[PDB]
Amino acid sequence: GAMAINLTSEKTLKEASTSMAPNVLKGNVIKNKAVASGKYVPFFGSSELSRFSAFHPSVLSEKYQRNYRPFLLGEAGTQSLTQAMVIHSMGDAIANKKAVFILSPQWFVKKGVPNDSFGAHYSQLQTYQWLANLTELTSGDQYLAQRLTKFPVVQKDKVLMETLANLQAGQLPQRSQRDYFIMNLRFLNREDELFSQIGMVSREPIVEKDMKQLPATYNFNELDQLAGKIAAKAINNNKFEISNGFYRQRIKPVLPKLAHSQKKWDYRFSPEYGDFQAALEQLAEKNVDVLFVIPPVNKRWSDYTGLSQDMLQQVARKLKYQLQEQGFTNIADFSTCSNERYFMADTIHLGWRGWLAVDRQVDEFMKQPLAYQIDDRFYQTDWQQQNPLVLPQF
Numbered sequence: 001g002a003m004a005i006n007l008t009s010e011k012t013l014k015e016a017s018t019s020m021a022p023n024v025l026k027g028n029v030i031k032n033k034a035v036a037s038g039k040y041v042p043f044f045g046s047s048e049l050s051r052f053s054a055f056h057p058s059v060l061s062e063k064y065q066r067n068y069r070p071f072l073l074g075e076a077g078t079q080s081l082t083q084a085m086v087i088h089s090m091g092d093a094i095a096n097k098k099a100v101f102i103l104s105p106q107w108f109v110k111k112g113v114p115n116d117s118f119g120a121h122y123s124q125l126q127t128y129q130w131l132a133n134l135t136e137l138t139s140g141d142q143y144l145a146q147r148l149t150k151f152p153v154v155q156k157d158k159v160l161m162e163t164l165a166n167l168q169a170g171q172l173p174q175r176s177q178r179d180y181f182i183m184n185l186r187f188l189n190r191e192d193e194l195f196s197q198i199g200m201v202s203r204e205p206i207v208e209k210d211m212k213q214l215p216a217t218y219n220f221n222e223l224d225q226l227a228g229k230i231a232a233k234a235i236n237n238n239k240f241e242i243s244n245g246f247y248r249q250r251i252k253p254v255l256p257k258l259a260h261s262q263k264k265w266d267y268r269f270s271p272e273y274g275d276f277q278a279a280l281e282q283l284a285e286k287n288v289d290v291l292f293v294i295p296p297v298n299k300r301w302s303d304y305t306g307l308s309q310d311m312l313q314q315v316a317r318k319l320k321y322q323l324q325e326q327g328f329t330n331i332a333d334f335s336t337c338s339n340e341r342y343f344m345a346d347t348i349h350l351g352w353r354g355w356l357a358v359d360r361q362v363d364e365f366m367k368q369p370l371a372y373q374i375d376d377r378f379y380q381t382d383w384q385q386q387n388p389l390v391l392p393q394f
């Protein structure tokens with residue numbers, strides 16, 4: 001590629017920070033440089049990150065010229081296992097820095113992350129890099145190996161499967177296995193440099209458009225009221241306070257079938273609790289200070305689908321126990337805000353007033369001036385299947 005294509009330029013990092021480009025998520029050059037600079041705070045999440053408005057953290061941070069910008073990492077289908085490898089691949093770039101982790105209760109389904117969701121975001125670069133540089137084996141490495149062998153995208157990689165088998169047996173990758181990954185990494189790193197920007201569509205034009213809606217100076221109460229007025233315009237074609245486009249495209253054509261459709265849904269038991277532990281161990285190993293966010297589900301929608309808000313509180317209690325028990329004490333739990341109007345953009349994605357509330361917690365967290373106690377037993381099936389009614393309220 002032409003030398004003028006500078007993947008680490010200031011403009012490139014700025015443009016990529018709001019793109020949610022999966023090729024950047026699967027790569028190393030761009031995302032690692034952004035986080036290593038200290039100016040970009042990685043936002044680990046999924047599809048909710050794209051719900052932009054005047055009150056999205058990417059817009060508020062640009063409008064008021066803060067000393068940091070979010071770097072959105074995730075999309076639909078990127079859960080904890082994918083993110084654990086994203087975090088690990090940053091290496092020392094994220095060490096001793098700050099991050100934001102947006103949990104989705106919907107991640108914690110009975111069977112965990114679907115095969116196609118993990119496969120669609122599987123990074124051979126990051127996975128091969130992890131195995132090539134492995135010099136000391138940890139329980140987290142063995143848990144990652146065990147989980148990866150369960151997905152078809154990995155099972156078709158025989159050398160990888162053979163290497164993951166040794167990890168589970170307590171052995172480092174064999175010399176011939178490490179050499180193999182190193183051979184391929186020469187191609188994978190070159191392809192990262194050449195192709196990681198294909199399909200990148202920055203949301204900077206949306207940022208600059210929404211900035212024109214915000215006052216010149218920041219005031220939460222003013223913004224909170226303004227978010228209600230703007231939201232009220234964009235949810236007027238239905239009674240569930242759902243965005244017009246989202247509603248007419250996904251809800252309206254099948255509205256009768258969705259009634260009571262979620263009465264039996266349950267997020268209390270899931271392999272995702274183990275995959276989430278994998279991300280927590282990676283963050284703790286690099287001394288990353290993290291703010292965790294738990295969103296609600298719109299009360300007006302859950303009343304129609306039958307999704308249990310009591311069950312969602314059981315899920316929050318389980319997650320906050322796993323966090324607090326191990327030293328993760330920065331938690332913005334908005335799961336009790338289900339009845340807050342204009343909080344969500346649609347059914348499950350944070351919206352106008354939700355992002356404003358998250359933005360305040362993020363901003364306060366970034367101004368805050370680590371005693372982690374990782375417990376490997378959170379990887380075990382008995383925790384994945386643990387009923388949270390016995391847990392305390394941390």
Ligand SMILES: [Cl-]
Pocket residue numbers: 064218363
């Ligand atoms: Cl501010």
Ligand SMILES: [Cl-]
Pocket residue numbers: 243244245246
């Ligand atoms: Cl819309």
Ligand SMILES: [Cl-]
Pocket residue numbers: 307308309310
């Ligand atoms: Cl309920």
Ligand code: NA
Pocket residue numbers: 046047048104348349
């Ligand atoms: Na989500």
